[PDB]
RNA sequence: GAACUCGCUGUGAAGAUGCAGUGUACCCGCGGCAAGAUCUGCCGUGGGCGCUGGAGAACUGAGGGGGGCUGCUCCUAGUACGAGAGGACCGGAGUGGACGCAUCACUGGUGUUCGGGUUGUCAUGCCAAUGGCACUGCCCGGUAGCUAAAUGCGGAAGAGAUAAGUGCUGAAAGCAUCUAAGCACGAAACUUGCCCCGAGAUGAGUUCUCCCUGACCCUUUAAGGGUCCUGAAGGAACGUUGAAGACGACGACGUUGAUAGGCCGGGUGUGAGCUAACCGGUACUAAUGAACCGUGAGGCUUAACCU
RNA sequence: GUGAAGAGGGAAACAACCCAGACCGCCAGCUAAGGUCCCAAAGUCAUGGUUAAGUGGGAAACGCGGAAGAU
RNA sequence: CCCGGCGAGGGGAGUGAAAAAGAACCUGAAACCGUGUACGUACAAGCAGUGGGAGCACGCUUAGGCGUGUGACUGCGUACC
């Protein structure tokens, strides 16, 4: 405990943070860049690329692979097809995140998740 | 006489010579640059302080930088103090590796333990306080390989090194 | 009622933090243990300052703490001693148990972050195929780590000093005597012998290394003060973070790069595929440039060295 | 007699023991009880001894023992 | 007129004897909370004060040792009803 542990804990419920996370990864793949708090951030990061690693390679299996953790068609329609071709020559980090201060509500850090080419 | 700084590769139960599969530790045998050896005059006592492994000059400062030049030798992971025998005296800049320990079967081992964070009462005691990551004292341990080859030192049962951890293996004489 | 709210001993309309004696303690905080929870008491951990020029480490180290546990067998040995019978100093070796320290590799458990089976309902234009809810819907295994049901070390030996006791020689007192003269061994009881903290030990310790080597003005005239320049060594707040962590704090990386994330390869798991946490490579991304604190030679007295 | 309704000084503090009844002030001296190795002020004074046991410096009755006590 | 948010509030100018009389509006002490001034305190134990007291800054007889502010320390000192 407290040594050698991947993935912050953010206390919730497995299944409620399961849906969160894909519904925060979908959000972010469909617009191109949000923003979210640094240790939210963190997790989508870590949790976003393997599925963009994924779409490098194309096949049935890998398509419904996608389709099961995305569970939206337009995002599977248009993976496999752009991001893979667009970070062909570019192996791992397909994302940066830059600070944005603090949410003055609630004084919560937040921060921009975006795509390293951002645009083309 | 002399003691060695190393590190804990790793501990698992490997087959003996007989073939039945017996617990063993897996100890790496790091060349111990001399760096310093004290006298009982200019200090009060007599010993040498030694060096282990190779750490980027970044991490070293230069005071440290002129200190390891002083002693004749590229700064390491850290400075280890061992007594001496009382008896010959070393020299500055050689290193030593397992060598003649396969000559007494008593060696003693020290090092850490796992990280283990600040438990609670109940856990700890069934009152907060620390356990683990403190210095060990077993002792009375056997040496079962001693090659020399491999710069691995392996001897009887479990060592007190968390993993990537710092240990000591020095020549004891209590049993 | 106000506090600059320590322990022990003695007195006490009788358990004294406020009385007499005695011992200890740098000042101020955070999290716990509740002996008497505002407070005192105990453990883990921090901020300010001191150790006298600053910083960096490495240690001697007074002092405090952990423990002196235990059954059996073997050549000794049915032998010496002992009338026969009975029956050793041995304590050298191995073999279990209660406990702490240490590691998951063997035994497995856990391992809701890995995989597979599957009931009801909803959804993807519809089948197949997928996802949410029903404790992870319910089950079968399990990566890394933690675990005891697993084993590794263990209660030394030795040394100093010993009480009782046992004594080599021997008078006062032609004897004896552990003592008057010469003058020893000796309990498992004390210390040391192994290790943890430990120079806040204010008695503030020792070793090495790096750096600061300007100027001017005033006063009540000195460890005096002030102004411009300088900002060294070293440290820290940020950025990546950890097998360190409640917060502090410690370690590594920080473009002169594998510190974190991801990708490839290898292995495990599950069942040709996915593979979280296991290992090698990869700058593809994040780790910048910068800024802040920190000096300008270190005070006085005595003694030995060349002047 | 004390306190009640007398302070102050000595006994470790101690209301009950001993000395001793404060008008006030004064940087003077002499004494009561009690002390003169210090803390804490005064002789490490003098004469002849007891005590060699730390008794002194806590212990009866009883025959030097009795003697074990305040963690 | 300016800052401020086109508010509230405040600061300059002027009126007003006076704005240390500004609509919370005569004079405006203490309890309570701050800043600066001068001193002490990070090895020292208890009704926190009492006499002594070197030092630390100032004005004084322009020293001549006087006071103001404090007390490192010393002997003593076990709240009121």
């Given at each position: 405990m407290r040594h050698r542990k991947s993935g912050r804990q953010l206390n919730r419920n497995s299944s409620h943070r399961q849906?969160?996370?894909?519904?925060?990864?979908?959000?972010?793949?469909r617009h191109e860049i949000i923003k979210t708090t640094l240790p939210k951030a963190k997790e989508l990061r870590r949790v976003v690329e393997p599925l963009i690693t994924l779409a490098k390679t194309d096949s049935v299996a890998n398509r419904?692979?996608?389709?099961?953790?995305?569970?939206?068609?337009?995002?599977?329609?248009?993976?496999?097809?752009?991001?893979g071709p667009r970070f062909a020559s570019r192996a791992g980090g397909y994302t940066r995140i830059l600070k944005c201060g603090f949410r003055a509500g609630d004084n919560a850090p937040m921060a921009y998740i975006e795509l390293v080419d951002r645009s083309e | 006489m002399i003691g060695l700084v190393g590190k804990k590769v790793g501990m698992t139960r490997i087959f003996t010579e007989d073939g039945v599969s017996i617990p063993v530790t897996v100890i790496e045998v790091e060349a111990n640059r001399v760096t310093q050896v004290k006298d009982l005059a200019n200090d009060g006592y007599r010993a040498i302080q030694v060096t282990?492994?190779?750490?980027?000059?970044?991490?070293?400062?230069?005071?440290?930088?002129?200190?390891?030049?002083?002693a004749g030798v590229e700064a390491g992971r850290g400075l280890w103090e061992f007594r001496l025998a009382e008896?010959?005296?070393?020299?500055?800049?050689?290193?030593?590796?397992?060598?003649?320990?396969?000559?007494?079967?008593?060696?003693?081992?020290?090092?850490?333990?796992?990280?283990?964070?600040?438990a609670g009462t109940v856990k700890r005691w069934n009152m907060a306080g620390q356990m683990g990551n403190?210095?060990?004292?077993?002792?009375?341990?056997?040496?079962?390989?001693?090659?020399?080859?491999?710069?691995?030192?392996?001897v009887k049962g479990a060592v007190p090194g968390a993993t990537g951890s710092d240990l000591i293996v020095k020549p004891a004489v209590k049993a």
């Open positions: 849906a969160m996370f894909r519904n925060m990864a979908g959000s972010l793949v419904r692979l996608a389709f099961a953790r995305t569970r939206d068609n337009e995002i599977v329609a248009k993976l496999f097809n752009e991001l | 282990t492994g190779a750490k980027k000059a970044n991490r070293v400062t230069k005071p440290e930088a002129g200190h390891f030049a002083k008896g010959e005296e070393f020299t500055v800049g050689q290193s030593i590796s397992v060598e003649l320990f396969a000559d007494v079967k008593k060696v003693d081992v020290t090092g850490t333990s796992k990280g283990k964070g600040f403190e210095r060990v004292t077993v002792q009375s341990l056997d040496v079962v390989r001693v090659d020399a080859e491999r710069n691995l030192l392996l």
